[PDB]
Amino acid sequence: GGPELGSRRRRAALATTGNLPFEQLPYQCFQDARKILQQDRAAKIAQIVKETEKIKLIEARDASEFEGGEAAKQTRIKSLRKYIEELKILADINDPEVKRRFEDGRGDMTKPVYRFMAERRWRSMDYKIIAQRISQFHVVPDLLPAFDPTMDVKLSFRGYQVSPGAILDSRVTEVAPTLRMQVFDKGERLLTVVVIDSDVPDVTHDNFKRRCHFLAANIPWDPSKTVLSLRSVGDRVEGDVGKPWLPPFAQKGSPYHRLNVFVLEQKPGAKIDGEALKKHLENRENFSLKGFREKFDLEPVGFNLFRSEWDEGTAEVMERHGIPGAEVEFKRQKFASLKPPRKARGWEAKRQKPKYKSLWKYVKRIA
């Protein structure tokens, strides 16, 4: 009856009740509803064998036979392959234990079923807020022309999970964040993580420039991995660090800085050279995600946001890492009226010089 068995209710209910599987509980309706789904899963598995053997026949068939050639043969197998995937999900979407295993976090993410429910959970709320953060914070069209996130990305600083688009302190955001990424797609792909600060103020040209605060690539990720620590990118996990984590900072006077954490997927069998990635940032002071993505043929999949402004701990954080620019404050540009000065008008305004000293009782000290 230890903590390794669950909660107090389970540990308590597991000693006063009988040992019997949940599926074997002798309840009329529950056992009568499990018998309907029982023969259904047998009918779905019986359909996966009829559609599986139907692909072999179409696979071992000369393209000349098909009136449409090889093009009409790949569109018929495409609809069949997709029709099998839906049958594999419909064979366990009604299982009562599969729902229990996924809710308890003990579900295997290497199976289509668990990835289907895991994706239906992310879209319910988490996708909605991040889709809103992309639009409201003007990530699009600023960084990307259009972006529809496809994977979940939650970043936490020193254990504490930070919500999307939250102004964090310069001391909290001093160490590499941990990414809690969940991928809902099959296979293992290389993921590229790029943290770009899009609000660096350039006073010389009166505009903002983009500065990359972190860059990594060649990070193998499967749908079974959850946590990724940006500290050990080249020590524990495989990866190439183009630029180590730079402590976010924001000079006094300038508005809050947006730090966009982007996760981009590399195409199959495309490993970025460890020396060509550290050369891209050389002599590049306006890191453009658009151009960078187009050169390595990457695709944005996940994204998260967190802002950072001037705080009490900003000055000290710059001292440790030698970040220059601490003794620089920004003041709002003031636009004075463009109307040329004009002589004052009125009876009182005319008679305000020493000439009309006898009429100064009507002109001076007016409320």
Partner 1 sequence: DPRIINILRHFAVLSPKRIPPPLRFGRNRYLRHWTIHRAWLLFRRQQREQRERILMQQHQSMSNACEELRNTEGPGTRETGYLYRVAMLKNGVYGLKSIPIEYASRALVETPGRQAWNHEWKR
Site string for partner 1, 85-124 (x = CB under 8 A): ---------x-x--xx------------------------
CB of 338 to RNA, least distance (A): 4
Partner in contact with 60, chosen from partner 1, RNA, none, beta carbon below 5 to 8 Å by kind: none
Partner in contact with 203, chosen from RNA, partner 1, none, beta carbon below 5 to 8 Å by kind: none
Residue closer to partner 1 by CB (options 25, 45) is: 25
For position 320 contacting RNA by CB under 7 A, the verdict is no
For position 290 contacting partner 1 by CB under 8 A, the verdict is no
For position 22 contacting RNA by CB under 7 A, the verdict is yes
For position 178 contacting RNA by CB under 7 A, the verdict is yes
Partner in contact with 36, chosen from partner 1, RNA, none, beta carbon below 5 to 8 Å by kind: partner 1
For position 36 contacting partner 1 by CB under 8 A, the verdict is yes
Closest CA to 292 of 276, 280, 278: 280
For position 46 contacting partner 1 by CB under 8 A, the verdict is no
Position among 5, 14, 25, 270 found at the interface with partner 1 (CB under 8 A): 25
CB of 34 to partner 1, least distance (A): 6
Residue closer to partner 1 by CB (options 103, 185) is: 103
For position 324 contacting RNA by CB under 7 A, the verdict is no
Name the one range near RNA by CB under 7 A: 69-77, 247-255, 269-277, 303-311: 69-77
Position among 42, 45, 63, 349 found at the interface with RNA (CB under 7 A): 349
Closest CA to 73 of 60, 89, 85, 84: 60
CB of 293 to RNA, least distance (A): 9
For position 11 contacting partner 1 by CB under 8 A, the verdict is no
Query: Which spans of this chain sit near partner 1 (rule: CB under 8 A)?
Result: 22, 25, 27, 29-30, 32-34, 36-37, 40, 94, 96, 99-100
